[PDB]
Design an enzyme around this catalytic site. Structure first.
Site, PDB file in Angstrom:
ATOM      1  N   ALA A   1       0.853  -1.175   0.000  1.00 48.71           N
ATOM      2  CA  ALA A   1       0.000   0.000   0.000  1.00 48.71           C
ATOM      3  C   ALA A   1       0.893   1.230   0.000  1.00 48.71           C
ATOM      4  O   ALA A   1       1.247   1.756   1.052  1.00 48.71           O
ATOM      5  CB  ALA A   1      -0.905  -0.010   1.230  1.00 48.71           C
TER       6      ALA A   1
ATOM      7  N   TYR B   1      -2.676   4.288  -2.354  1.00 49.91           N
ATOM      8  CA  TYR B   1      -3.264   2.977  -2.110  1.00 49.91           C
ATOM      9  C   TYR B   1      -3.519   2.627  -0.648  1.00 49.91           C
ATOM     10  O   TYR B   1      -4.183   1.630  -0.353  1.00 49.91           O
ATOM     11  CB  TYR B   1      -2.427   1.888  -2.782  1.00 49.91           C
ATOM     12  CG  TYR B   1      -2.644   1.846  -4.275  1.00 49.91           C
ATOM     13  CD1 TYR B   1      -2.052   2.789  -5.113  1.00 49.91           C
ATOM     14  CD2 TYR B   1      -3.496   0.903  -4.846  1.00 49.91           C
ATOM     15  CE1 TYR B   1      -2.309   2.798  -6.484  1.00 49.91           C
ATOM     16  CE2 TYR B   1      -3.760   0.901  -6.216  1.00 49.91           C
ATOM     17  CZ  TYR B   1      -3.163   1.852  -7.028  1.00 49.91           C
ATOM     18  OH  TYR B   1      -3.433   1.869  -8.378  1.00 49.91           O
TER      19      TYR B   1
ATOM     20  N   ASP C   1      -3.373  -7.965  -4.633  1.00 50.11           N
ATOM     21  CA  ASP C   1      -3.474  -6.521  -4.824  1.00 50.11           C
ATOM     22  C   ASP C   1      -4.345  -5.971  -3.701  1.00 50.11           C
ATOM     23  O   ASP C   1      -5.245  -6.658  -3.216  1.00 50.11           O
ATOM     24  CB  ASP C   1      -4.104  -6.187  -6.178  1.00 50.11           C
ATOM     25  CG  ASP C   1      -3.137  -6.367  -7.334  1.00 50.11           C
ATOM     26  OD1 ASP C   1      -1.913  -6.329  -7.100  1.00 50.11           O
ATOM     27  OD2 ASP C   1      -3.606  -6.531  -8.479  1.00 50.11           O
ATOM     28  N   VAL C   2      -4.096  -4.725  -3.307  1.00 51.26           N
ATOM     29  CA  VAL C   2      -4.836  -4.117  -2.202  1.00 51.26           C
ATOM     30  C   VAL C   2      -6.151  -3.404  -2.542  1.00 51.26           C
ATOM     31  O   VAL C   2      -7.031  -3.298  -1.684  1.00 51.26           O
ATOM     32  CB  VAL C   2      -3.921  -3.141  -1.414  1.00 51.26           C
ATOM     33  CG1 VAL C   2      -3.748  -1.841  -2.185  1.00 51.26           C
ATOM     34  CG2 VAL C   2      -4.500  -2.884  -0.024  1.00 51.26           C
ATOM     35  N   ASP C   3      -6.292  -2.913  -3.772  1.00 52.63           N
ATOM     36  CA  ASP C   3      -7.529  -2.231  -4.164  1.00 52.63           C
ATOM     37  C   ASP C   3      -8.589  -3.274  -4.505  1.00 52.63           C
ATOM     38  O   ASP C   3      -9.118  -3.331  -5.622  1.00 52.63           O
ATOM     39  CB  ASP C   3      -7.282  -1.292  -5.355  1.00 52.63           C
ATOM     40  CG  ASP C   3      -6.609  -1.980  -6.531  1.00 52.63           C
ATOM     41  OD1 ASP C   3      -6.675  -1.423  -7.645  1.00 52.63           O
ATOM     42  OD2 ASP C   3      -6.007  -3.060  -6.355  1.00 52.63           O
TER      43      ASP C   3
ATOM     44  N   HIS D   1      -7.008 -15.084 -14.986  1.00 58.06           N
ATOM     45  CA  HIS D   1      -7.394 -13.698 -15.228  1.00 58.06           C
ATOM     46  C   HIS D   1      -8.845 -13.696 -15.706  1.00 58.06           C
ATOM     47  O   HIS D   1      -9.188 -14.396 -16.657  1.00 58.06           O
ATOM     48  CB  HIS D   1      -6.490 -13.090 -16.299  1.00 58.06           C
ATOM     49  CG  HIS D   1      -6.625 -11.606 -16.435  1.00 58.06           C
ATOM     50  ND1 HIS D   1      -5.610 -10.734 -16.108  1.00 58.06           N
ATOM     51  CD2 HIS D   1      -7.657 -10.840 -16.864  1.00 58.06           C
ATOM     52  CE1 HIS D   1      -6.010  -9.493 -16.332  1.00 58.06           C
ATOM     53  NE2 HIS D   1      -7.248  -9.532 -16.791  1.00 58.06           N
TER      54      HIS D   1
ATOM     55  N   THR E   1      -2.431 -11.770 -23.652  1.00 54.39           N
ATOM     56  CA  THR E   1      -1.528 -10.632 -23.761  1.00 54.39           C
ATOM     57  C   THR E   1      -0.153 -10.896 -23.145  1.00 54.39           C
ATOM     58  O   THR E   1       0.346 -10.092 -22.357  1.00 54.39           O
ATOM     59  CB  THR E   1      -2.138  -9.358 -23.126  1.00 54.39           C
ATOM     60  OG1 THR E   1      -2.409  -9.583 -21.738  1.00 54.39           O
ATOM     61  CG2 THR E   1      -3.434  -8.984 -23.835  1.00 54.39           C
TER      62      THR E   1
ATOM     63  N   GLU F   1       3.431  -9.079 -14.194  1.00 57.93           N
ATOM     64  CA  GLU F   1       2.451 -10.078 -14.602  1.00 57.93           C
ATOM     65  C   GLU F   1       2.932 -10.875 -15.811  1.00 57.93           C
ATOM     66  O   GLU F   1       2.634 -12.064 -15.944  1.00 57.93           O
ATOM     67  CB  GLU F   1       1.120  -9.395 -14.915  1.00 57.93           C
ATOM     68  CG  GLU F   1       0.049 -10.319 -15.459  1.00 57.93           C
ATOM     69  CD  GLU F   1      -1.307  -9.646 -15.513  1.00 57.93           C
ATOM     70  OE1 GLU F   1      -1.969  -9.552 -14.455  1.00 57.93           O
ATOM     71  OE2 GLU F   1      -1.704  -9.197 -16.609  1.00 57.93           O
TER      72      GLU F   1
HETATM   73  C1  LIG Z   1     -11.357  -7.315 -14.159  1.00 59.09           C
HETATM   74  C2  LIG Z   1     -11.743  -7.338 -15.428  1.00 59.09           C
HETATM   75  C3  LIG Z   1     -10.747  -6.563 -16.363  1.00 59.09           C
HETATM   76  C4  LIG Z   1     -10.746  -6.801 -17.969  1.00 59.09           C
HETATM   77  C5  LIG Z   1      -9.957  -5.671 -18.728  1.00 59.09           C
HETATM   78  C6  LIG Z   1      -8.501  -6.010 -19.123  1.00 59.09           C
HETATM   79  O1  LIG Z   1      -7.860  -6.165 -17.807  1.00 59.09           O
HETATM   80  C7  LIG Z   1      -6.447  -5.902 -17.859  1.00 59.09           C
HETATM   81  O2  LIG Z   1      -5.786  -7.069 -18.370  1.00 59.09           O
HETATM   82  C8  LIG Z   1      -4.367  -6.872 -18.556  1.00 59.09           C
HETATM   83  C9  LIG Z   1      -3.819  -8.132 -19.224  1.00 59.09           C
HETATM   84  O3  LIG Z   1      -4.214  -8.189 -20.589  1.00 59.09           O
HETATM   85  C10 LIG Z   1      -3.698  -6.535 -17.215  1.00 59.09           C
HETATM   86  O4  LIG Z   1      -3.801  -7.646 -16.341  1.00 59.09           O
HETATM   87  C11 LIG Z   1      -4.376  -5.323 -16.564  1.00 59.09           C
HETATM   88  N1  LIG Z   1      -3.837  -5.124 -15.235  1.00 59.09           N
HETATM   89  C12 LIG Z   1      -5.895  -5.540 -16.466  1.00 59.09           C
HETATM   90  O5  LIG Z   1      -6.534  -4.323 -16.017  1.00 59.09           O
HETATM   91  C13 LIG Z   1      -6.422  -3.936 -14.682  1.00 59.09           C
HETATM   92  O6  LIG Z   1      -6.733  -5.058 -13.852  1.00 59.09           O
HETATM   93  C14 LIG Z   1      -8.024  -5.622 -14.141  1.00 59.09           C
HETATM   94  C15 LIG Z   1      -8.230  -6.742 -13.148  1.00 59.09           C
HETATM   95  C16 LIG Z   1      -9.107  -4.595 -13.927  1.00 59.09           C
HETATM   96  O7  LIG Z   1      -9.186  -4.333 -12.544  1.00 59.09           O
HETATM   97  C17 LIG Z   1      -8.843  -3.296 -14.699  1.00 59.09           C
HETATM   98  O8  LIG Z   1      -9.799  -2.295 -14.338  1.00 59.09           O
HETATM   99  C18 LIG Z   1      -7.414  -2.799 -14.415  1.00 59.09           C
HETATM  100  O9  LIG Z   1      -7.109  -1.734 -15.299  1.00 59.09           O
HETATM  101  O1  LIG Z   2       1.664   3.546  -6.128  1.00 60.54           O
HETATM  102  C1  LIG Z   2       1.284   2.372  -6.121  1.00 60.54           C
HETATM  103  C2  LIG Z   2       0.865   1.496  -7.372  1.00 60.54           C
HETATM  104  C3  LIG Z   2       0.484   0.226  -7.095  1.00 60.54           C
HETATM  105  N1  LIG Z   2       0.437  -0.353  -5.795  1.00 60.54           N
HETATM  106  C4  LIG Z   2       0.002  -1.775  -5.616  1.00 60.54           C
HETATM  107  O2  LIG Z   2       0.048  -2.459  -6.882  1.00 60.54           O
HETATM  108  C5  LIG Z   2      -1.189  -3.188  -7.101  1.00 60.54           C
HETATM  109  C6  LIG Z   2      -1.457  -3.273  -8.614  1.00 60.54           C
HETATM  110  O3  LIG Z   2      -1.666  -1.969  -9.133  1.00 60.54           O
HETATM  111  P1  LIG Z   2      -2.920  -1.224  -9.742  1.00 60.54           P
HETATM  112  O4  LIG Z   2      -4.041  -1.324  -8.767  1.00 60.54           O
HETATM  113  O5  LIG Z   2      -2.462   0.162 -10.106  1.00 60.54           O
HETATM  114  O6  LIG Z   2      -3.158  -2.210 -10.973  1.00 60.54           O
HETATM  115  P2  LIG Z   2      -4.467  -2.921 -11.565  1.00 60.54           P
HETATM  116  O7  LIG Z   2      -4.914  -4.104 -10.784  1.00 60.54           O
HETATM  117  O8  LIG Z   2      -5.388  -1.775 -11.754  1.00 60.54           O
HETATM  118  O9  LIG Z   2      -3.966  -3.556 -12.967  1.00 60.54           O
HETATM  119  C7  LIG Z   2      -2.214  -2.397  -6.342  1.00 60.54           C
HETATM  120  O10 LIG Z   2      -3.299  -3.236  -5.942  1.00 60.54           O
HETATM  121  C8  LIG Z   2      -1.433  -1.993  -5.082  1.00 60.54           C
HETATM  122  O11 LIG Z   2      -1.444  -2.994  -4.088  1.00 60.54           O
HETATM  123  C9  LIG Z   2       0.803   0.398  -4.662  1.00 60.54           C
HETATM  124  O12 LIG Z   2       0.778  -0.070  -3.516  1.00 60.54           O
HETATM  125  N2  LIG Z   2       1.203   1.709  -4.882  1.00 60.54           N
HETATM  126 HG   LIG Z   3       1.047  -8.804  -4.582  1.00 56.62          HG
HETATM  127 MN   LIG Z   4      -5.154  -3.740  -8.564  1.00 60.11          MN
END
Ligand SMILES: CCCCCCO[C@@H]1O[C@H](CO)[C@H](O)[C@H](N)[C@H]1O[C@@H]1O[C@@H](C)[C@@H](O)[C@@H](O)[C@@H]1O
Ligand SMILES: O=c1ccn([C@@H]2O[C@H](COP(=O)(O)OP(=O)(O)O)[C@@H](O)[C@H]2O)c(=O)[nH]1
Ligand SMILES: [Hg+2]
Ligand SMILES: [Mn+2]
Ligand SMILES: [Hg+2]
Ligand SMILES: [Hg+2]
Ligand SMILES: [Hg+2]
Ligand SMILES: [Hg+2]
Length: 264
Positions: free
Chosen positions: A60, A64, A130-132, A152, A164, A222
């Protein structure tokens, strides 16, 4: 190890599939965890007899820290309830961590950004997420295994060519179009402390090599996670029930439960 006690539950039906709508075992014989595939009472018994301790790690940083309250409060309601849990919150704002009330046998450590060896002596399994996010339903010992990845929610029904993955050969995370089992999320993985540390160490080294060669994988960590799990098959794979976004993907019939979801 120790014998299970007498238990009364429905007899498994050899000629009756668990689910007929989804794949429940990978080609390397790792179970794919979906609701209906496991009897939690049996699993809870097995893991409690082992006095299992699960570490849950989250980072966090910056803004975050605002997701910690809901994350921890809901984890108290749905994550490994009944078992020993040790939360590890890595943050740049220790004083900003919310005061959350924990159930007995559960503790939380705030690490400002700890020795990797500490994990080996404090917990049996590590779960990194992830924390959010927020827990909405049961997330228990059915996920525990040496090494697990999560499907995923945006690619579980896609063909490998659509995944991807990093497609540039110059990257250590490179995966060609004719390779790949599934597209795993970077936001929910885990396993034994030993296996998790091996994964993160491998990812760390691979990313350093990429950096040196002036390249950054399309989806960063990832992308490397996917390369690692392609070459080191997970012993359990979690269905999308374990990481979903109802706002973006709704609630498909194939998902009997939405256990861990994205926070709007
Ligand atoms: C949760 C459903 C999300 C579908 C949209 C594509 O999600 C994105 O996928 C790429 C890989 O191709 C990455 O893993 C990104 N981090 C994904 O988007 C982020 O994480 C997903 C889980 C959603 O929370 C999305 O809002 C974020 O941008
Ligand atoms: O400034 C930052 C950016 C990311 N995160 C951590 O990284 C994870 C993945 O990032 P983000 O939520 O931005 O990605 P998403 O799931 O939207 O692809 C988050 O859940 C947080 O736990 C954090 O702690 N600080
Ligand atoms: Hg993690
Ligand atoms: Mn996240
Ligand atoms: Hg079943
Ligand atoms: Hg971790
Ligand atoms: Hg990494
Ligand atoms: Hg990684």
């Amino acid at each position: 190890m120790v014998s299970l006690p007498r238990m009364v539950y429905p007899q498994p039906k050899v000629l009756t599939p668990c689910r007929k709508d989804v794949l429940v075992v990978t080609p390397w014989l790792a179970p794919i965890v979906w609701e209906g595939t496991f009897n939690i009472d049996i699993l809870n018994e097995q893991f409690r007899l082992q006095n299992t301790t699960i570490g849950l790690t989250v980072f966090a940083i910056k803004k975050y820290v605002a997701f910690l309250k809901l994350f921890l409060e809901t984890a108290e309601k749905h994550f490994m309830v009944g078992h020993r849990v040790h939360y590890y919150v890595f943050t740049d704002q220790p004083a900003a961590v919310p005061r959350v009330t924990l159930g007995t046998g559960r503790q939380l450590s705030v690490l400002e950004v700890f020795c990797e060896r500490r994990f080996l002596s404090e917990v049996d399994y590590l779960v990194c997420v992830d924390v959010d996010m927020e827990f909405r339903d049961h997330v228990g010992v059915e996920i525990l295994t040496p090494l697990f990845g999560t499907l995923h929610p945006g690619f579980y029904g896609s063909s490998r060519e659509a995944f991807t993955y990093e497609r540039r050969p110059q990257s250590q995370a490179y995966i060609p179009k004719d390779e790949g089992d599934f597209y795993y999320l970077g936001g929910f993985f885990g396993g034994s402390v030993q296996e998790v540390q091996r994964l993160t160490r491998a990812c760390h080294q691979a990313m350093m090599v990429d950096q040196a060669n002036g390249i950054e994988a399309v989806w960063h960590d990832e992308s490397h996670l996917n390369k690692y799990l392609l070459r080191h098959k997970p012993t359990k794979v979690l269905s999308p029930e374990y990481l979903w976004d109802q706002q973006l993907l709704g609630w498909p019939a194939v998902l009997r439960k939405l256990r861990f979801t994205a926070v709007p």
